[PDB]
Design a protein around this ligand. Structure first.
Ligand SMILES: *C(=O)[C@@H](NC(=O)/C(=N\OC)c1csc(N)n1)[C@@H]1N=C(C(=O)O)C(=C)CS1
Length: 634
């Protein structure tokens, strides 16, 4: 045996060869196998413009002893016709008169036949035992096209008993070859299928696009390769090494001997950071919660993603994501966490603060008045929690309350232009934008996170020249948009004291050569440190405290979902207003980590297009439930 063959180099009467191994497996972080190779055998016939009538049914009669066949493809016509083949007996006795007419030459053959494959279907068709549809189901498949088109006879479900029996008699069977190939096998089901990706099927060879890049390394378009995501991304490890000989030709045939240069070897096995038992439970809770939220009003809500990370080193432990339709039909959408972007809202604020501290615009514990701002001509902004009054508050109480206006004042102070009632808005915020977007970037927001998959988007980044109103919105998460992974990289950076680490999913690579044994560690796949935030540890602890307050103080936004986590949790929410077909909606985001005192888990969650609240759905619960399940025993 097995190795659907590749190539034959040819110099001056000298030959070289190359054959195909199977791909690395793919394992969870405790070794549980996620992606295996299974064997698919398959019997082929090869017909001739020079073997018609009977030597068909002669091969087919022999084969209907080594294999059993699926007759779900036979047709009344083929039955009809095969009847004539098989009963020259009763057939000759059906066309007694027509025989003569054909013979005297007053009906053609055509007509004779059509009149015959019309004469029977009742009594004498039910003269076909199971034996014969068996030999027919092979015969049928033994011609569809002429020439040497190697038509498959049995494809699905070819038992090792069957493949052996018939490779064993290939001699007695003229026309019949047998192959075996390797096809991926997914023990855990749909789970993470979209992230694993896909391999072309050699019928495909390499597909039209990925070419060049595949050929500028050295492949056949016969070759099966990695068509997407993990398979695409660790192609050069999950692929084997190839079997390779060199030959000595002479005379008009002679080959004196070969020397084995490269014996072969299966792909290196790849271990993921996933914990599949966590992964599965997350998918579970997600759905319980989508169904819970739909039955409280959220019938238009249409996405729901969740990343879970270990913030001390970037490990992605789970990654989940459904699309929802208007009646609840889930589709898997795990790639959604880093290929889609959303407006996230009030949950970037801890990064905005960290941009103010860096630039002297504010400093730790600076208090300010939350009140309706009034701008020239009559524009007003306000914090939801305080639509009408006036309230002085810290930064860390700004995070707890999710005060938009503490963040607008910070934003203006950063733009050289502190708030004064009546004021007009700086007509040129270019350099404040640059400073503030550079601060957010430092915690992951706005950049690609570095993840080891393709198609990571850094989010929609529209410009900042003279749109002050936007510049402000950007300080409360309502201009630039972000992937749920960025949210998860940012909350993790807060959680590990200002280190922004590359998320990864690939964890370790293994030298596998024997089958099913793992074999030695080859390479680790580190979550690299991208950058440290430009901030004092007193600045970082202010934010951390604000996050802890937002989850554990009676007036925190995340009180009713995170206060009774089995271990203390910290985080932050956002509720961005959005529109869908002109109706009013909210995205709704969560981020957090636990335990507060030495975090081992960090997460982001996104729901999109929930209803606008009077009734505050509590989609954080999904987050509380994951922290509770993760930490069930400490
Ligand atoms: C942050 O997003 C901020 N604003 C909103 O939530 C808005 N509408 O809420 C119904 C909104 C969108 S654009 C704008 N000027 N206001 C705060 N977010 C939270 C939170 O979830 O912490 C609140 C609870 C409401 S106010």
């Amino acid at each position: 045996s097995g190795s659907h063959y590749k190539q034959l180099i040819k110099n001056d009467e000298n030959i070289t060869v190359n054959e195909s191994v199977p791909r690395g497996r793919i394992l969870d972080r405790n070794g549980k196998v996620l992606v295996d190779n299974a064997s698919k055998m398959s019997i082929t016939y090869t017909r001739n413009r020079k073997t018609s009538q009977k030597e068909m049914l002669n091969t087919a009669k022999k084969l209907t002893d080594l294999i059993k066949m699926d007759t779900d493809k036979i047709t009344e016509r083929d039955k009809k016709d095969f009847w004539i083949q098989m009963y020259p007996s009763s057939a000759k006795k059906l066309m007694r008169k027509e025989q003569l007419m054909l013979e005297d030459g007053s009906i053609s053959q055509d007509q004779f036949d059509t009149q015959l494959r019309d004469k029977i279907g009742k009594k004498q068709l039910k003269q076909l035992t199971k034996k014969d549809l068996q030999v027919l189901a092979i015969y049928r498949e033994m011609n569809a096209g002429s020439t040497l088109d190697p038509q498959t006879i049995k494809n699905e479900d070819v038992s090792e008993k069957e493949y052996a029996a018939v490779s064993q008699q290939l001699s007695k069977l003229p026309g019949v070859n047998t192959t075996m190939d390797w096809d991926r096998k997914y023990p855990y089901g749909d789970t993470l299928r979209g992230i694993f990706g896909d391999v072309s099927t050699s019928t495909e060879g390499i597909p039209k696009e990925l070419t060049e890049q595949y050929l500028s390394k050295g492949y056949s378009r016969n070759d099966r390769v990695g068509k997407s995501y993990l398979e695409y991304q660790y192609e050069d490890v999950l692929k084997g090494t190839k079997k390779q000989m060199k030959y000595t030709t002479d005379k008009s045939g002679r080959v004196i001997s070969s020397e084995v240069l490269n014996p072969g070897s299966r792909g290196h096995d790849l271990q993921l950071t996933i914990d599949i038992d966590l992964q599965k439970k997350v998918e579970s809770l997600l759905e319980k919660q989508i169904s819970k939220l739909r039955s409280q009003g959220a019938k238009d809500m249409d996405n729901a993603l969740m990343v879970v990370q270990n913030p001390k080193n970037g490990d992605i432990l789970a990654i989940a994501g459904k699309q929802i339709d208007k009646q609840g039909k889930l589709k898997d959408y795990d790639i959604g966490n880093f290929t889609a972007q959303y407006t996230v809202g009030s949950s970037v604020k801890g990064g905005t603060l960290l941009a103010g501290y860096q630039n002297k615009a504010i400093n730790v514990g600076e208090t300010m008045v939350d009140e309706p701002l009034k701008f020239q001509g009559g524009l007003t902004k306000r914090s939801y929690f305080n639509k009408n009054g006036h309230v002085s508050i810290d930064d860390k109480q700004a995070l707890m309350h999710s005060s938009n206006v503490y963040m607008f004042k910070t934003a203006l102070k950063l733009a050289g232009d502190p708030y004064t009632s009546g004021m007009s808005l700086p007509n040129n915020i270019a350099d404040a934008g640059r400073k503030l977007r550079k601060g957010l970037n430092q915690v992951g927001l706005g950049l690609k996170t570095g993840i080891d998959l393709p198609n990571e988007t850094p989010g929609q980044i529209e410009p900042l020249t003279n749109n002050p109103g936007n510049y402000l919105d950007l300080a409360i998460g309502q201009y630039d948009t972000y992937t749920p992974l960025q949210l998860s990289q940012y909350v993790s950076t807060i959680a590990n004291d200002g280190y922004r680490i590359q998320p990864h999913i690939g964890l370790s690579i293994y030298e596998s050569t024997n089958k099913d044994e793992t074999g030695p560690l080859k390479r680790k796949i580190k979550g690299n440190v991208l950058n440290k935030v430009n901030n004092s540890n007193d600045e970082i602890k202010e934010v951390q405290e604000g996050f802890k307050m937002a989850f554990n103080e009676k007036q925190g936004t995340g009180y009713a979902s995170f206060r009774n986590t089995v271990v203390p949790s910290a985080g932050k929410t956002g509720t961005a207003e959005v529109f869908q077909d002109g109706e009013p909606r909210v995205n709704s985001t969560y981020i957090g980590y636990a335990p507060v005192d030495d975090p081992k888990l960090s997460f982001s969650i996104v729901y999109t297009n929930q209803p606008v609240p009077p009734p505050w759905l509590n989609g954080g619960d999904l987050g509380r439930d994951v922290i509770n399940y993760y930490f069930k025993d400490k």
